[PDB]
Amino acid sequence: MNPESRVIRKVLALQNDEKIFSGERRVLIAFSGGVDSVVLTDVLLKLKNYFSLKEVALAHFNHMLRESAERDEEFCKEFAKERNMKIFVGKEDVRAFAKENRMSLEEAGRFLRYKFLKEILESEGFDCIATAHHLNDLLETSLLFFTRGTGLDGLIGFLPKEEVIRRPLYYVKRSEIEEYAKFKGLRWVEDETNYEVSIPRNRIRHRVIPELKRINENLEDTFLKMVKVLRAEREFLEEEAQKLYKEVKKGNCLDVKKLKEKPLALQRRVIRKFIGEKDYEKVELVRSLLEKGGEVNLGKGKVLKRKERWLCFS
Amino acid sequence: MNPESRVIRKVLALQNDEKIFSGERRVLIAFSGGVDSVVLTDVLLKLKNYFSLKEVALAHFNHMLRESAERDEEFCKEFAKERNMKIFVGKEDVRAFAKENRMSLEEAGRFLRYKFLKEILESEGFDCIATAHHLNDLLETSLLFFTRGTGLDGLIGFLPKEEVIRRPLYYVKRSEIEEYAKFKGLRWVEDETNYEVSIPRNRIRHRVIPELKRINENLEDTFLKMVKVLRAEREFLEEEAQKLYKEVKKGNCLDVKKLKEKPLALQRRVIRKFIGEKDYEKVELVRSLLEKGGEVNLGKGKVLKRKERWLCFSPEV
Ligand SMILES: Nc1ncnc2c1ncn2[C@@H]1O[C@H](COP(=O)(O)OP(=O)(O)NP(=O)(O)O)[C@@H](O)[C@H]1O
């Protein structure tokens, strides 16, 4: 039981549990160059046949931010040639783009990168994208949502499989990855970005998680268990929700006769889908219009009113 | 608005949302002597009639741990007199009863305190006990449970009203409580939790939260919104789990054939109920028998075995 099987074990556990790969032939990996993506790439190449995968390629997006961006790219290309993998690289002034598009460098880099990945996925014929997101990212994301404001979705954070994205390392904790990378003497790009605490993610990773571990050494493992519990509870809530939805939402309204009597949790659920919004406040504003007649003005010029035992727009 | 309104609005906001007081006539305040308690009292005394209380009393518990704990008892005795309030003081060797019963000083103090409070409540006839538990406490508890691994149950933390307890400062932030006490030129016992980070709660408070608030200064406000959503969903899951429980349970067993195919989330909550344990592993361990017939052992000699379409506790031992 070494740093390698320890991980492979968790990755196969994910497979059995989530059907991470189930027919996909070509896997494009979002290759940052960092440990995670490296360890990930090593695991997919090893489990390639186990997954019945015809191909595994890397896609590296050069943000043009770090002054090392140019060298890191070259390292990725070399990493690709090394393992004889197809490598597609995209470059875009994340800087400019963020400005001209009033976006923050982060979401902008996210946008341009994912846009690049799809460009390659779609134009080169790969069936999905693999991402090195791991259990610690999951932990960090969830704590970031807990901090910024959230519901189950935030707490659950990302999923092991969503649309064309696959996160094989989902169950793996950073420390295991880091050990894995070591055990197998892998190479990788440094996380310069790391420790700029000015970034919430790093704040959580470097200040919060550490303090939390003084109370629970096994924070990551107990967390994952929390998430699992939450995910099924969430699924049940969403299912039991859709049911209530098309049983009350008839046409362009909501049979308030039925909603009011049904469970608060579900109401907010139905209302959330209908209203198109997801913030606690608005949702709760529309909901009031189930006992208290009237109307309510919300976001993008849209408003809903209560024509007696029905709730529709305006 | 001024610091007074800032707090009272929230206290009334809570009354509306939870019906904190709805008939109780004699309120026993768990009076520590700290701001929360001071402000809680000040506030409840300002709403005495509003809430239709026939009497508000103080109940201070001397843990007998700190040397100051003495001046403290005397403070509450004075405070109580300054307010013309009935107060019930209580000395107890926390340190001694102390975990001779195997339990952290806190655990014991908690026990003895609430024992003492529940004691005063029964003997002197109080309808409930009001605590100074506030929004920052909730935030702290939630993170504590978040940390210690848990589900919605721990995520929700304590409720604003529960059994014989009431927490009027639920929506109130610690800072609002402090601005308030200062604004009203109130006196109170110093905190000191800043010298006991050794305790998880205290660590979350002084070393964790402050950091989270550099990301979102309104963390408390943001946090409250999540609790509201979660409490609802948890209450829903409980209703369902509870129904399914009574549905699948026969005698001292569970009809596997009938539970085996209902939603996972409910299977887990039902096992929990039956099993008498909340640990994920114990629970999954038992769930495994819904499809895989056999036997399983948990902790205190309690072993479950699946007999045909049934799942029961083995009577051995
Ligand atoms: N000396 C005391 N006398 C009476 N009540 C107290 C005293 N100390 C603490 N309490 C009470 O409990 C609150 C203070 O927080 P404390 O009880 O110490 O939190 P905790 O023990 O960490 N867990 P929890 O009780 O659930 O918040 C006050 O609002 C009182 O209700």
XYZ file of C-alpha atoms and ligand atoms in Angstrom:
662
model
C 0.000 0.000 0.000
C 2.036 2.916 -1.355
C 1.395 6.503 -2.505
C 0.433 5.084 -5.911
C -2.081 2.372 -5.051
C -3.459 4.564 -2.306
C -4.479 6.979 -5.115
C -5.302 4.419 -7.823
C -7.485 2.854 -5.181
C -9.426 6.069 -4.652
C -9.668 6.657 -8.393
C -11.101 3.161 -9.032
C -13.428 3.685 -6.066
C -14.654 6.782 -7.832
C -15.082 4.783 -11.026
C -17.160 2.063 -9.428
C -19.176 4.650 -7.474
C -19.711 7.274 -10.154
C -19.117 5.590 -13.521
C -16.527 8.277 -14.263
C -15.760 6.692 -17.598
C -18.432 4.607 -19.249
C -18.086 4.662 -23.001
C -15.944 7.717 -23.579
C -13.064 7.013 -25.944
C -11.109 10.280 -26.006
C -10.182 12.163 -22.855
C -8.813 15.678 -23.031
C -7.001 16.662 -19.851
C -7.048 20.317 -18.704
C -3.291 20.425 -18.256
C -2.061 23.249 -15.998
C 1.348 21.691 -15.512
C 1.044 21.676 -11.736
C 1.233 18.626 -9.483
C -2.461 17.859 -9.597
C -2.730 17.844 -13.374
C 0.498 15.874 -13.549
C -0.583 13.218 -11.082
C -3.926 13.105 -12.808
C -2.338 12.643 -16.215
C -0.232 9.831 -14.800
C -3.292 8.073 -13.383
C -5.353 8.265 -16.586
C -2.499 6.996 -18.683
C -2.144 4.035 -16.312
C -5.869 3.321 -16.096
C -6.340 4.083 -19.786
C -7.206 0.523 -20.789
C -9.088 -0.209 -17.601
C -11.395 2.598 -18.678
C -11.576 1.374 -22.286
C -10.121 4.697 -23.448
C -8.805 5.004 -26.970
C -6.981 8.264 -26.339
C -5.749 10.704 -23.673
C -4.507 14.155 -24.641
C -3.545 17.333 -22.865
C -4.819 20.843 -23.309
C -2.771 23.614 -21.754
C -4.035 27.170 -21.625
C -1.369 29.871 -21.396
C -2.880 32.797 -19.452
C 0.066 35.060 -20.318
C -0.026 36.170 -16.680
C 2.897 34.627 -14.766
C 6.242 35.747 -16.151
C 6.939 32.012 -16.301
C 3.887 31.333 -18.484
C 6.176 30.870 -21.490
C 8.469 28.357 -19.839
C 5.631 26.449 -18.165
C 3.992 26.023 -21.571
C 7.193 24.597 -22.956
C 7.329 22.259 -19.968
C 3.808 21.108 -20.775
C 4.672 20.495 -24.386
C 7.698 18.498 -23.272
C 5.604 16.677 -20.699
C 3.304 15.779 -23.586
C 6.014 14.685 -25.991
C 7.496 12.683 -23.115
C 4.402 10.556 -22.620
C 3.748 10.738 -26.330
C 0.470 12.575 -25.847
C -1.295 14.905 -28.211
C -0.994 18.448 -26.781
C -3.114 21.423 -27.725
C -2.101 24.778 -26.410
C -4.122 27.970 -26.398
C -2.925 31.450 -25.583
C -4.876 34.614 -24.909
C -4.247 37.900 -23.127
C -6.170 36.966 -19.984
C -5.125 40.445 -18.930
C -6.657 42.481 -21.735
C -9.720 40.236 -21.995
C -10.503 40.733 -18.310
C -10.483 44.503 -18.810
C -12.346 44.846 -22.098
C -14.883 42.386 -20.710
C -15.164 43.809 -17.217
C -14.288 40.477 -15.907
C -11.874 39.605 -13.134
C -8.675 37.855 -14.170
C -9.865 34.682 -12.511
C -13.244 34.214 -14.175
C -11.714 35.554 -17.384
C -8.946 32.993 -17.329
C -11.571 30.394 -16.449
C -13.695 31.478 -19.391
C -10.920 31.670 -21.958
C -9.371 28.381 -20.798
C -12.587 26.398 -20.769
C -13.457 28.037 -24.073
C -10.141 26.762 -25.406
C -10.774 23.299 -23.999
C -14.158 23.076 -25.686
C -12.642 24.436 -28.888
C -10.268 21.487 -28.816
C -12.739 18.972 -27.481
C -15.200 19.851 -30.233
C -12.745 20.401 -33.121
C -10.389 17.553 -32.420
C -12.946 14.927 -31.534
C -12.439 14.121 -27.862
C -15.425 12.987 -25.785
C -14.711 14.713 -22.507
C -12.411 16.802 -20.342
C -10.591 15.490 -17.311
C -9.686 17.852 -14.544
C -7.237 17.488 -11.693
C -9.666 18.893 -9.133
C -9.168 16.959 -5.894
C -10.716 16.462 -2.469
C -8.851 19.442 -1.032
C -10.073 21.741 -3.792
C -13.465 20.305 -2.983
C -12.877 21.131 0.707
C -11.633 24.613 -0.154
C -14.458 25.281 -2.604
C -17.025 24.200 -0.083
C -15.498 26.416 2.615
C -15.359 29.291 0.144
C -19.062 28.809 -0.575
C -19.789 28.467 3.129
C -18.038 31.828 3.429
C -19.440 33.705 0.409
C -22.928 32.336 0.946
C -24.524 29.123 -0.254
C -26.868 26.150 -0.076
C -26.210 22.432 -0.674
C -24.846 23.053 -4.157
C -22.067 25.209 -2.787
C -21.391 22.902 0.133
C -21.328 19.863 -2.160
C -19.091 21.840 -4.467
C -18.136 20.304 -7.756
C -19.023 16.774 -8.777
C -16.854 13.931 -10.013
C -18.779 14.013 -13.323
C -20.724 16.921 -14.861
C -21.510 17.496 -18.522
C -18.222 16.911 -20.345
C -16.046 17.186 -17.247
C -14.514 14.337 -15.246
C -12.562 14.712 -11.994
C -10.850 11.339 -11.370
C -8.907 12.628 -8.319
C -12.136 13.682 -6.601
C -11.503 11.387 -3.579
C -7.792 12.151 -3.475
C -6.467 14.685 -0.987
C -3.722 17.123 -1.953
C -1.274 15.395 0.413
C -1.853 12.038 -1.345
C -1.381 13.692 -4.731
C 1.785 15.378 -3.527
C 3.020 12.057 -2.146
C 1.930 10.246 -5.291
C 3.805 12.721 -7.471
C 6.850 12.161 -5.295
C 6.651 8.390 -4.992
C 6.774 8.303 -8.803
C 9.282 11.112 -9.239
C 7.093 13.252 -11.458
C 7.872 16.792 -12.572
C 5.577 19.812 -12.400
C 5.094 23.576 -12.569
C 5.228 25.495 -9.304
C 2.228 27.165 -7.776
C 3.558 30.734 -7.693
C -0.003 31.934 -7.202
C 0.068 29.976 -3.974
C 0.312 31.921 -0.771
C -0.827 35.132 -2.152
C -3.372 35.113 0.686
C -5.119 37.967 -1.078
C -6.811 35.141 -2.996
C -9.693 33.718 -0.891
C -8.867 30.183 -1.994
C -5.338 30.511 -0.609
C -6.605 32.298 2.465
C -8.728 29.185 3.165
C -5.978 26.751 2.228
C -3.253 28.481 4.259
C -5.071 30.009 7.217
C -8.466 28.367 7.682
C -7.953 24.706 6.843
C -4.788 24.607 9.015
C -6.639 25.950 12.030
C -9.522 23.554 11.376
C -7.116 20.631 11.329
C -6.045 21.444 14.879
C -9.566 20.399 15.813
C -9.924 17.545 13.336
C -6.800 15.955 11.899
C -9.064 14.066 9.473
C -10.947 17.086 8.123
C -10.741 15.896 4.521
C -12.041 12.370 5.176
C -14.922 13.404 7.397
C -15.744 16.144 4.902
C -16.038 13.748 1.993
C -18.442 11.743 4.113
C -20.421 14.885 4.720
C -20.537 15.611 1.015
C -21.699 12.083 0.187
C -24.496 12.333 2.698
C -25.390 15.786 1.362
C -25.340 14.714 -2.295
C -27.992 12.037 -1.875
C -30.044 14.311 0.326
C -29.674 16.954 -2.367
C -30.669 14.505 -5.099
C -33.749 13.462 -3.172
C -34.605 17.134 -2.681
C -34.166 17.925 -6.399
C -36.173 14.880 -7.485
C -38.947 15.380 -4.978
C -38.785 18.974 -6.236
C -39.253 18.371 -9.967
C -42.237 16.225 -8.958
C -43.827 19.102 -7.067
C -42.893 21.421 -9.936
C -44.915 19.858 -12.758
C -47.938 19.339 -10.520
C -48.148 22.997 -9.564
C -46.511 24.857 -12.459
C -49.261 24.577 -15.042
C -48.740 26.913 -17.977
C -46.958 30.041 -16.824
C -48.095 29.985 -13.197
C -47.961 28.003 -9.952
C -51.006 26.423 -8.300
C -50.524 28.288 -5.001
C -53.356 26.101 -3.675
C -50.909 23.201 -3.810
C -47.574 24.888 -3.042
C -48.441 26.604 0.256
C -49.479 23.289 1.806
C -46.373 21.451 0.561
C -42.916 21.559 2.323
C -41.105 24.880 2.674
C -37.880 23.349 1.414
C -39.633 22.166 -1.729
C -41.534 25.415 -2.224
C -38.300 27.387 -2.376
C -37.192 24.635 -4.721
C -40.092 25.002 -7.100
C -40.117 28.794 -6.784
C -36.381 28.796 -7.526
C -36.829 27.015 -10.857
C -39.882 29.031 -11.920
C -38.480 32.413 -10.846
C -35.261 31.684 -12.716
C -33.396 33.237 -9.777
C -31.422 31.544 -7.017
C -30.629 34.093 -4.285
C -32.362 33.534 -0.944
C -33.829 37.029 -0.901
C -35.724 37.157 -4.186
C -36.894 33.548 -3.882
C -38.249 34.371 -0.442
C -39.956 37.463 -1.854
C -41.865 35.518 -4.503
C -42.745 32.898 -1.902
C -44.460 35.455 0.310
C -46.910 35.646 -2.583
C -48.452 32.327 -1.570
C -50.194 33.463 1.626
C -50.108 37.233 1.042
C -51.688 38.356 -2.238
C -50.075 40.946 -4.494
C -47.109 41.116 -6.856
C -43.332 41.537 -6.715
C -40.767 43.223 -8.971
C -37.425 41.439 -9.237
C -34.378 41.190 -11.475
C -34.196 41.803 -15.228
C -37.471 43.667 -15.698
C -39.374 40.560 -14.617
C -42.199 40.496 -12.094
C -44.701 37.948 -10.815
C -48.166 38.529 -9.459
C -50.755 36.409 -7.668
C -54.025 36.147 -9.598
C -55.841 34.410 -6.746
C -54.992 30.700 -6.559
C -52.311 31.051 -9.258
C -48.870 32.669 -9.366
C -47.640 33.981 -12.714
C -45.590 36.791 -14.282
C -46.543 40.242 -15.610
C -30.355 53.350 13.215
C -28.537 53.227 16.545
C -27.056 50.157 18.288
C -30.202 49.680 20.284
C -32.465 49.300 17.285
C -29.906 47.206 15.471
C -30.266 44.521 18.144
C -33.913 44.737 19.197
C -35.045 44.687 15.568
C -33.285 41.371 15.196
C -34.727 40.102 18.457
C -38.228 40.911 17.265
C -37.393 39.641 13.780
C -36.577 36.337 15.440
C -39.723 36.399 17.543
C -41.743 36.652 14.383
C -39.944 33.888 12.510
C -39.818 31.400 15.377
C -42.406 32.473 17.898
C -39.669 32.448 20.575
C -42.127 33.399 23.282
C -45.670 32.256 22.835
C -47.094 31.613 26.264
C -44.144 31.130 28.582
C -44.713 33.170 31.741
C -41.560 32.808 33.854
C -38.219 33.104 32.044
C -35.024 31.857 33.670
C -32.048 33.536 32.079
C -28.807 31.582 31.960
C -26.830 34.524 33.297
C -23.073 34.287 32.843
C -22.365 37.956 33.504
C -20.741 38.526 30.113
C -22.031 40.949 27.478
C -24.316 38.480 25.765
C -26.018 37.762 29.075
C -25.971 41.393 30.061
C -27.408 42.479 26.747
C -29.826 39.540 26.663
C -31.140 40.595 30.073
C -31.203 44.269 29.208
C -33.131 43.359 26.067
C -35.557 40.920 27.703
C -36.182 43.437 30.469
C -37.030 45.993 27.778
C -39.554 43.582 26.245
C -40.720 42.017 29.497
C -44.337 42.963 28.754
C -44.002 42.816 24.994
C -43.343 39.068 25.400
C -45.899 38.749 28.174
C -43.476 37.433 30.757
C -44.699 37.422 34.357
C -41.135 37.296 35.627
C -37.559 37.306 34.364
C -34.955 35.773 36.647
C -31.226 35.295 36.590
C -29.484 31.963 37.067
C -25.716 32.227 37.390
C -23.618 29.132 37.742
C -20.274 29.402 39.473
C -18.066 26.803 37.784
C -15.350 27.307 40.382
C -12.496 27.171 37.905
C -11.242 30.747 37.688
C -10.244 32.790 40.719
C -12.289 35.650 39.245
C -15.278 33.279 39.124
C -15.844 34.682 42.599
C -15.945 38.385 41.795
C -18.120 37.190 38.914
C -20.710 35.571 41.165
C -20.673 38.779 43.209
C -21.053 40.820 40.013
C -24.172 38.961 38.940
C -25.519 39.324 42.465
C -24.998 43.079 42.181
C -26.205 43.250 38.581
C -29.317 41.367 39.614
C -29.903 43.828 42.465
C -29.235 46.839 40.235
C -32.098 45.405 38.178
C -34.260 44.336 41.116
C -34.098 40.840 39.653
C -34.400 37.496 41.339
C -31.176 35.545 40.860
C -30.240 31.956 41.644
C -26.540 31.480 42.260
C -24.954 28.042 42.213
C -21.536 26.859 43.374
C -20.318 23.474 42.165
C -16.966 21.720 41.992
C -16.923 21.455 38.201
C -13.261 20.531 38.458
C -14.242 17.621 40.889
C -17.681 16.153 39.700
C -15.155 17.018 37.194
C -14.785 14.369 34.727
C -14.633 11.856 37.534
C -17.529 11.093 35.288
C -15.047 11.034 32.400
C -15.709 14.289 30.494
C -13.839 17.478 29.597
C -14.257 20.324 32.080
C -16.486 21.928 29.475
C -18.631 18.814 29.043
C -19.021 18.635 32.820
C -19.611 22.351 33.243
C -22.167 22.142 30.478
C -23.804 19.195 32.233
C -23.746 20.715 35.706
C -24.865 24.104 34.422
C -27.840 22.864 32.417
C -28.473 20.373 35.195
C -28.516 23.284 37.623
C -30.638 25.355 35.256
C -33.059 22.496 34.570
C -33.081 22.047 38.341
C -34.041 25.662 39.001
C -36.605 25.509 36.206
C -38.391 22.521 37.750
C -38.122 23.398 41.423
C -39.057 27.078 41.125
C -41.460 26.666 38.240
C -40.177 28.284 35.083
C -41.605 27.645 31.665
C -38.270 27.983 29.886
C -34.626 29.005 29.979
C -33.352 31.813 27.795
C -29.767 31.779 26.646
C -27.550 34.494 25.209
C -26.595 32.223 22.282
C -26.215 34.504 19.276
C -25.473 34.455 15.564
C -21.721 34.359 16.011
C -22.188 31.383 18.321
C -24.230 29.686 15.610
C -21.594 30.468 12.984
C -19.021 28.967 15.369
C -21.065 25.829 16.121
C -21.806 25.316 12.442
C -18.117 25.459 11.532
C -17.321 23.211 14.491
C -19.690 20.551 13.214
C -18.669 21.252 9.637
C -15.183 20.439 10.852
C -16.027 17.410 12.941
C -17.689 15.894 9.938
C -21.454 15.956 9.952
C -24.625 16.396 7.979
C -27.305 19.032 7.803
C -28.130 18.359 11.434
C -24.848 19.764 12.689
C -24.659 22.317 9.906
C -27.875 23.871 11.171
C -26.388 24.097 14.640
C -28.818 24.859 17.440
C -32.305 26.157 16.752
C -33.727 29.428 18.019
C -36.261 27.533 20.131
C -35.676 24.002 21.360
C -37.388 21.899 24.002
C -37.306 24.153 27.058
C -34.622 26.481 25.705
C -34.955 29.795 23.905
C -32.242 31.830 22.250
C -33.500 35.457 21.680
C -30.146 36.704 20.311
C -30.081 34.061 17.573
C -29.991 36.633 14.685
C -27.727 39.046 16.563
C -24.024 39.396 15.771
C -21.540 39.493 18.620
C -20.384 42.918 17.412
C -23.938 44.282 17.522
C -24.149 42.996 21.065
C -20.979 44.849 21.914
C -21.917 48.106 20.186
C -25.133 47.801 22.154
C -23.598 47.290 25.586
C -21.229 50.185 24.936
C -23.990 52.382 23.614
C -26.012 51.731 26.755
C -22.946 52.185 28.950
C -23.474 48.751 30.493
C -20.887 46.971 32.662
C -20.016 43.299 32.259
C -17.579 40.477 32.935
C -14.633 40.291 30.544
C -14.609 37.487 27.963
C -11.309 35.547 28.232
C -12.133 33.005 25.489
C -9.223 34.671 23.714
C -6.967 32.806 26.162
C -8.488 29.385 25.564
C -8.096 28.770 21.839
C -7.223 25.313 23.167
C -10.974 24.769 22.887
C -12.263 24.223 19.314
C -15.074 26.762 19.667
C -12.623 29.390 20.872
C -10.251 28.539 18.002
C -12.976 28.835 15.393
C -13.913 32.153 16.938
C -10.604 33.985 17.248
C -8.432 32.239 14.691
C -10.874 30.993 12.035
C -13.769 33.426 11.665
C -11.535 36.518 11.603
C -9.834 35.022 8.548
C -13.094 34.092 6.819
C -14.248 37.664 7.377
C -11.356 39.043 5.344
C -13.000 37.312 2.420
C -16.561 38.234 3.385
C -16.964 40.796 6.186
C -20.676 40.062 6.264
C -20.003 36.364 6.802
C -22.503 36.280 9.644
C -25.253 37.710 7.448
C -24.352 35.437 4.564
C -24.213 32.537 6.978
C -27.679 33.153 8.362
C -29.193 32.863 4.883
C -27.708 29.392 4.452
C -29.021 28.137 7.792
C -32.491 29.208 6.790
C -32.372 27.199 3.570
C -30.822 24.181 5.261
C -33.173 24.065 8.244
C -36.022 23.689 5.748
C -34.437 20.914 3.733
C -33.329 19.087 6.864
C -36.825 19.348 8.280
C -38.162 17.874 5.035
C -35.721 14.959 5.029
C -36.696 14.262 8.647
C -40.443 14.237 7.887
C -39.852 11.737 5.091
C -37.286 9.627 6.914
C -39.639 9.560 9.886
C -42.589 8.375 7.788
C -40.579 5.757 5.914
C -39.276 4.659 9.308
C -42.690 3.849 10.780
C -43.579 2.303 7.417
C -40.715 -0.200 7.210
C -40.311 -0.996 10.912
C -42.071 -4.051 12.306
C -41.547 -5.106 15.887
C -37.809 -4.654 16.326
C -36.872 -4.982 12.650
C -36.954 -3.277 9.255
C -38.643 -4.690 6.152
C -35.616 -4.727 3.865
C -37.748 -5.528 0.837
C -39.576 -2.254 1.452
C -36.659 0.005 2.489
C -34.161 -1.441 -0.002
C -35.562 0.580 -2.902
C -36.593 3.910 -1.362
C -34.211 6.925 -1.780
C -30.671 6.570 -0.410
C -30.947 9.751 1.642
C -33.982 8.263 3.370
C -32.463 4.840 3.779
C -29.584 6.461 5.658
C -31.830 8.544 7.864
C -34.007 5.545 8.634
C -31.037 3.313 9.459
C -29.795 6.110 11.756
C -33.128 6.137 13.564
C -33.338 2.349 13.976
C -29.626 1.839 14.541
C -29.506 4.477 17.276
C -26.271 5.841 15.822
C -25.430 8.709 13.458
C -21.947 7.774 12.311
C -21.714 7.488 8.524
C -19.758 4.213 8.627
C -22.047 2.472 11.134
C -24.977 3.566 8.968
C -23.566 2.479 5.615
C -22.438 -0.722 7.316
C -26.062 -1.507 8.112
C -27.413 -0.299 4.786
C -25.214 -2.908 3.102
C -27.581 -5.545 4.471
C -30.536 -4.206 2.469
C -29.246 -6.040 -0.601
C -26.482 -8.198 0.917
C -28.133 -10.496 3.471
C -25.977 -11.341 6.486
C -24.817 -10.031 9.865
C -23.058 -6.890 11.202
C -21.638 -5.616 14.520
C -21.559 -1.964 15.556
C -20.375 -0.963 19.012
C -21.892 -1.849 22.369
C -22.608 -5.507 21.643
C -25.315 -4.433 19.182
C -25.241 -6.636 16.102
C -27.759 -6.601 13.253
C -28.610 -9.589 11.085
C -30.788 -9.898 8.012
C -33.245 -12.772 8.174
C -35.067 -13.126 4.852
C -36.875 -9.849 4.139
C -36.045 -8.728 7.678
C -33.244 -6.883 9.435
C -33.050 -7.128 13.218
C -30.828 -6.877 16.262
C -29.366 -10.183 17.393
C -30.440 -10.987 20.990
C -27.162 -12.677 21.961
C -25.111 -11.222 24.838
N -22.039 30.959 34.179
C -23.093 30.638 33.436
N -24.308 30.622 34.007
C -25.405 30.401 33.302
N -25.316 30.191 32.000
C -24.137 30.184 31.356
C -22.964 30.401 32.068
N -21.948 30.207 31.233
C -22.458 29.876 30.048
N -23.789 29.873 30.111
C -24.640 29.872 29.086
O -24.397 29.441 27.816
C -24.111 30.574 26.980
C -22.617 30.854 26.801
O -21.996 29.948 25.882
P -21.611 28.429 26.265
O -22.770 27.714 26.844
O -20.338 28.441 27.024
O -21.355 27.778 24.813
P -20.797 26.269 24.705
O -20.710 25.722 26.080
O -19.580 26.281 23.855
N -21.917 25.386 23.918
P -23.445 25.943 23.939
O -23.889 26.047 25.489
O -24.390 25.088 23.180
O -23.347 27.415 23.285
C -24.742 31.755 27.713
O -25.662 32.328 26.787
C -25.538 31.082 28.830
O -26.803 30.686 28.302
